[PDB]
Write a protein that binds this ligand. Sequence first.
Ligand SMILES: O=P(O)(O)O[C@H]1[C@H](OP(=O)(O)O)[C@@H](OP(=O)(O)O)[C@H](OP(=O)(O)O)[C@@H](OP(=O)(O)O)[C@H]1OP(=O)(O)O
Length: 263
Amino acid sequence: GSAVSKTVCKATTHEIMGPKKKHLDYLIQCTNEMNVNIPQLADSLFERTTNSSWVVVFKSLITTHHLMVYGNERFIQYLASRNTLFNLSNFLDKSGLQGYDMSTFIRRYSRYLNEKAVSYRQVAFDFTKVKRGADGVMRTMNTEKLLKTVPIIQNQMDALLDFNVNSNELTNGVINAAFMLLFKDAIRLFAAYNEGIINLLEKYFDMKKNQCKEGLDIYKKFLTRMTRISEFLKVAEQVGIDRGDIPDLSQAPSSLLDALEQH
Ligand SMILES: O=P(O)(O)O[C@H]1[C@H](OP(=O)(O)O)[C@@H](OP(=O)(O)O)[C@H](OP(=O)(O)O)[C@@H](OP(=O)(O)O)[C@H]1OP(=O)(O)O
């Protein structure tokens, strides 16, 4: 409570760096305790986002993202249960140049976190965390749910990619901490998107005709998103990310010729 609220404050001070590991680890432990009240924890994070300073607000966003990734699932479950999440579409800190330049990224980052919650609410699992492979969810899913789901991923991916940062804009510790988390989410989200396309192609011939048509439209949009992903990983390459962590895209885009199995 007070110990929770104080830690939220420490995670979100005016200092120009991401939240410290020590405050983050305590918060993650908080999400794991059955007696902690999640809503009060969340509310303290939303309050920090009404501050006028870009640094405070960005750190609060980052703390929230880190909890959605490393915290107990009950945290993102609560976030998804609300009606309103972040409302920072018009944020602008004019106190200094860094302010003006960071404001745009705050807007875009907060929209991605909203979409991450909405996606959880729509499908009841986190795309980033579920079993991959051949024995996992994305892959062993009936044709109905599939046609339903893939479009939600696409939408979450689009919001992720609208962050649209260049190498030369990654110039302070706050925006870099955000980007590292965005990188992690992007790679897991891609894996899940790809697993679904694989399911589709597998099933795209044995299926009804109007289905086939929804299908086609997804494969379609996947191929342009492929291009955007690759531009995003190239930013990561330019910044210096270990090339071993960057995934190989050389995989599944040559078959656009079922645009004729609508024979
Ligand atoms: O007493 P600790 O739990 O070992 O942490 C204290 C201090 O806490 P206090 O403000 O109560 O003195 C700060 O911890 P946080 O407020 O960040 O939780 C931090 O000091 P700074 O804010 O100056 O970085 C630093 O711990 P650390 O070395 O892990 O950053 C250390 O302060 P001192 O070593 O100067 O006593």
